[PDB]
């Protein structure tokens, strides 16, 4: 009832222009994206706990001091609207197009921007983080394999299932690592850049929903999926993370299956179809 929500925002934030404002909507919550501010409004009394959740994650991440922006609660959580609301900062900047990230005159700068964030994430106080964030579970990939075999294997060719079993197996084989902050979805769309005196600067990281105490290889895998091995090799060279390659490849070989399984679970037909194209001939 976006009319109500808009009135809730006008009343609580008079100077917010909702003319030409984003709307993300869901079964879960509505989000009004204004110029400098995001308003999140849960739809259920149970979804309401997401608001202190988001505050606690973003506060914990901000306390690590990554040297780049993350969304900041601009308000306390409020018990106005139907089930509460939270006002977060909007970060400025644009994902780096893959062609731009990799030009010879910027690729070293892009590599160090990723490295300095990933290094601050790897040096987080994990004893503090583990009180707030999810912690990588040793069972995670066994369970994911189980759901992939139940939901997706029937839609695959026999070659699909053989390929998927080897990809699931490389993830199930990994020993449990929980040694720093992990974003969990560190693809290009969640990383925001600005041209700062004619060179890229990494100014913001958004979408901390998958954030955890975990394996730094999982964020390097996502950087590689967005930007290719030329970039991730340079990032890994700078971090001295050459040991992580087997883990990096095991995360990356699960990405199409993660997308397929989420397409099935979320009811996004295009995500399901797109994640499965390697696993069948039709």
């Amino acid at each position: 009832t976006l009319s109500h929500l808009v009135d809730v925002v006008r009343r609580a934030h008079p100077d917010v222009d909702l003319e030409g404002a984003g709307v993300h909507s869901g079964q879960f919550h509505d989000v009004l994206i204004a110029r400098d501010r995001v308003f999140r409004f849960p739809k259920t009394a149970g979804a309401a706990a997401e608001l202190p959740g988001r505050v606690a994650v973003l506060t914990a991440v901000d306390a690590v001091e990554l040297g780049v922006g993350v969304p900041v609660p601009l308000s306390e959580v409020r018990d106005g609207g139907p089930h509460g609301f939270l006002v977060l900062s909007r970060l400025h900047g644009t994902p780096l197009e893959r062609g731009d990230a990799t030009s010879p005159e910027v690729i070293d700068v892009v590599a160090a921007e990723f490295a300095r964030v990933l290094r601050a994430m790897a040096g987080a106080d994990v004893e503090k983080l583990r009180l707030v964030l999810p912690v990588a579970d040793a069972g995670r990939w066994r369970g994911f394999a189980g759901r992939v075999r139940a939901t997706l294997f029937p839609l695959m060719s026999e070659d699909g299932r053989a390929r998927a079993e080897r990809e699931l197996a490389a993830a199930v084989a990994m020993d449990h690592v929980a040694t720093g902050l992990v974003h969990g979805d560190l693809g290009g769309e969640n990383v925001l850049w600005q041209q700062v005196e004619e060179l890229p600067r990494l100014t913001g990281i958004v979408d901390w929903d998958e954030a955890k105490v975990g394996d730094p290889a999982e964020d390097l895998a996502a950087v590689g999926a967005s930007y290719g091995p030329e970039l991730v090799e340079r990032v890994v060279a700078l971090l001295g993370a050459g040991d992580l390659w087997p883990r990096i490849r095991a995360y990356q070989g699960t990405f199409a299956l993660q997308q397929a399984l989420a397409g099935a679970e979320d009811g996004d037909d295009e995500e399901l179809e797109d994640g499965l194209t390697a696993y069948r001939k039709l």
Binding site: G184, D185, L186, G187, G188, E189, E210, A221, A222, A225, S226, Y251, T254, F255, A256, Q258, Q259, A262, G263, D268, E270, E271, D274, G275
Partner: peptide
């Protein structure tokens, strides 16, 4: 969504 993970 999406191939990164989403």
């Amino acid at each position: 969504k999406a191939x990164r993970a989403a």
